[PDB]
Amino acid sequence: EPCFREENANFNKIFLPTIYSIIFLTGIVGNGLVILVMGYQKKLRSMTDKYRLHLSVADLLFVITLPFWAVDAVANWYFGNFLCKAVHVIYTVNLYSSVLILAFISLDRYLAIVHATNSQRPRKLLAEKVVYVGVWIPALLLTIPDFIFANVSEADDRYICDRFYPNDLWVVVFQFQHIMVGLILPGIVILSCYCIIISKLSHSKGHQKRKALKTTVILILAFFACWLPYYIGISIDSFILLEIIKQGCEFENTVHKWISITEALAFFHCCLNPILYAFLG
Amino acid sequence: KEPCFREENANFNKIFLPTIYSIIFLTGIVGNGLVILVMGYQKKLRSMTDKYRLHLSVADLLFVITLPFWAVDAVANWYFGNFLCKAVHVIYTVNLYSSVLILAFISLDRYLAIVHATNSQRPRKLLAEKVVYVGVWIPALLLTIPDFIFANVSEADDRYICDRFYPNDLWVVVFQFQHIMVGLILPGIVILSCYCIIISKLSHSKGHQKRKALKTTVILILAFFACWLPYYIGISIDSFILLEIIKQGCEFENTVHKWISITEALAFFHCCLNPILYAFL
Amino acid sequence: KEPCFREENANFNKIFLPTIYSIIFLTGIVGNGLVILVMGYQKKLRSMTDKYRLHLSVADLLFVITLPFWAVDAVANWYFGNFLCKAVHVIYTVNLYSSVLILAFISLDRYLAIVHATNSQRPRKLLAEKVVYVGVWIPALLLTIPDFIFANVSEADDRYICDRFYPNDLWVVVFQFQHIMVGLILPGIVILSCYCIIISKLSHSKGHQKRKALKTTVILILAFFACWLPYYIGISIDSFILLEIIKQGCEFENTVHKWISITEALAFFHCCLNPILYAFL
Amino acid sequence: KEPCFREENANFNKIFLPTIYSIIFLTGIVGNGLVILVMGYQKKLRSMTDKYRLHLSVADLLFVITLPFWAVDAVANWYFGNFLCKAVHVIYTVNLYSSVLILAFISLDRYLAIVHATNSQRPRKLLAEKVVYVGVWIPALLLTIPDFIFANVSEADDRYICDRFYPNDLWVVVFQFQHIMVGLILPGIVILSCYCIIISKLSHSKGHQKRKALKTTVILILAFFACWLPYYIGISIDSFILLEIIKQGCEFENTVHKWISITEALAFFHCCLNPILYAFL
């Protein structure tokens, strides 16, 4: 059957640059302020702020290349092949690095709350040495298909910055790997550590001296609430690609529009760390 | 007279239903697991309302266990046979009746605590340990007999839909009217009458602090009924579409069906607001 | 020059109007019953504003008594004859004029209390006890004579609609302009003049605490006028569509009618907010 | 290769534009009359910032005098000749440039107050009394000469529309680019530079209370730029529609024009939020 993938997305070409420009402005302002305050003046106090500085570094790296996507939303990619590869690599590095920073924040809170008597040296050892090899090295190692497959090419109307796979099984296995690494395993880890944290804090109702859990809980919940509908949309699209859901091509076009809109709305995690720093929430 | 022609390929429902279902499933499983872990296993409950809220969280956990079956039924079609179809239907029906009967019990417990604050303490213990089970769980289980005997899966054109199939439309009208009655009218009248008595008796006090615990209860009851009101209005209008009252519309019936599906998805947020009210105060 | 192009279905209005009507009916009946029970029967009123708020709640109760008649007229057609049609219309018009005249009385009472805080205590009592009835209720009853005569039931295509029928369009133009004038212009000018005088005189005070009671009054008046503004804009544009001023649109008239119906449904939320402002402070 | 595909059936814009225009007109006239009455005539200004805000309110007042005229032009067409068209256009352009130059002056005043808190008290007075007029009002008046010559009334299909009419499209590209530059780029860079310096210098303070007055200023500036950002993004895309860059969309141009009208209606809320920030703190 002929799908004939044509969107006529006249609203997306005027709505996506607006969202991208708003996120670029507030992300570059907030991440520049956070890096200037903590990464230069050494104004960090708690152990969470080192992880939030790493998160702001990855956030600034992504919002540097966000105007390229803002141009590519309405016009097409006339920048180059190397810029296409660099933009895709920076996107994937930020996407995995923010998730692994949040997992490390949850693990640090589990070590601080439960192991409150002996885990002082392990938390410092984590946040000074192990965070790099546990976050940035997997994030850079997961960008090898971004280094290989990402290429700009014609689609018989204009240029497109994307990646090209030899088979569709590669596309669906990379989508399933993206779902499994981005959402499932770190979400399970964060939920397990916070369930243990709540179960141990229920035994310590006599003292309420700590309330640094609210900031990390709000940040993690807002991050996953931002990233949930895009993950649902690409899960439904991956099940479409695996001959499970066969409901015409108008449903596939609706899934494409939903994935684009929710992917642009899922960049609100750029304005999540410094807005929470401004509100002290 | 065109009878129905019920084929409109509503594509946005099949992409919006699993998003709402998965969001409600995640927050319901996390919040109800936390509430059952804290106040059901560790014995953290202090007031008498927390036992009924633990019962509500048990029913909420039971429904959000089977919510991903509804997500799979939304975007794909049913593949789990008839026993899982009956189990999912009976769990949803017993949860829907049990939550509103639990809320009626909380409201009448507040009526007993506020008005008869001197000689009614042992009736409250008899209300909260012994007669609560035959108050909520026994009638909710006895209301599931047509759910046990009529829910099945059809031999359709490779869809195999999960639903209850009635011999005629009179049974559909009778059971829809009974559902509207037991779900909204009698517990709503009981809650409104006891709260009117509470407000009338509370004006004689000199601004006492005993109404500080009333705010969470009235917020929970108001949020539950504001979640369930538009779905009840939609199915009341659909019940009046049957038995030849609003029969002049054909596409209006399809709009009513879409409104019922959307408001039924939005009315599952009553699982969201029970542990959220424990996260706040 | 096409004659009518009357829209025949209005599918979403018939499913959206009874939902809004039922929500406003339930909240208005509960809140106004509580307010009349607490401050009208039990003598809980302390300040001078609460008598006017009790009058406003009496008018609110009178309108939300007949709101389910409007819901039945929205989704079904009218079956209650001509006497109920006249009673529902006269109650709606009495409430609509009485609420804004009551709010003008509250604003002028606040002007008398703030500016003349020394010698105006018995004129405020004469305002709130005796002359208030001939201030609001007698003009609201005298403004219903065309509503008493001209509101009837017609013979449509088996509809029996409930509406006010005029001999010609000059009468409906004149009465729409009079409704706009008495509903918005003169009481709005009176309220704005008294509040400008209050704000100008309040700057001479040294930050006193007498303006703490002004916040609820200005919030109630601002909420009322923000509720009623888009309906007045819509019927002003419809009145200027009449008298052949805007004549280039024919589907624009149908859009104006749909906007008037939707904003009229949303402008009945002035019954909602009066006891809501008593639930908060 | 279709030339224009001229489209005039925007039914919702003629019913949504006067509603937003009337709401902003009423709130702006009430708030700016109150602010000019309190802090301009009665001498209630205390801090150095409020004088600039008074200037802003004067500019805001100048806009909301001419706001109902556009409301007539939203739903009817222009009947007031060419002199009123020129006056309305020059008033809107003066207000649009004057508000952002006033905010640049407020941000640079905050930079002078925070960083040079010891030796800069008489330069702040010279900033706020003498050089402020040649700072904001003289460049805003000098930026209105092409508004003075080119704004007129044309001979349409019995419409008499009010707009500026250029000799060719090169002039409208140059003036749109200059409008984008002076309205967003240079004052935005100035405000961001002063606030980055303020945030960098404020880290050396030991948690002083001098940043309590910074919150209202950053909230006002952020609300102004968040109001004006989607309109600026839309006119940037509309200017790039010219010069044959994204020419391939024809109905996309009409969607861009509808977006321009909607976001220009929504971006007049910057007159609303100056006295609203005085109602709160």
Partner: protein, 65 residues
């Protein structure tokens, strides 16, 4: 209800320039509490347009009965 929307006219810009030969079907709309609307379907354009109640051709067509 001070406003009325369910009951407006079909009466809209009663034209005095209508051709009797081009008038193929002059449908008179039967409505209550309204003016006598007479929408005639044209022959050249095949579109219904209003006709005034004081038109000579409409009066001659009504007087044929």
């Amino acid at each position: 209800k001070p406003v009325s929307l369910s009951y407006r006219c079909p009466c809209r810009f009663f034209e005095s320039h209508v051709a009797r030969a081009n008038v193929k079907h002059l449908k008179i709309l039967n409505t209550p509490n309204c003016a006598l609307q007479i929408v005639a379907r044209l022959k050249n354009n095949n579109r219904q347009v209003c006709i005034d109640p004081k038109l000579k051709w409409i009066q001659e067509y009504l007087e044929k009965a």
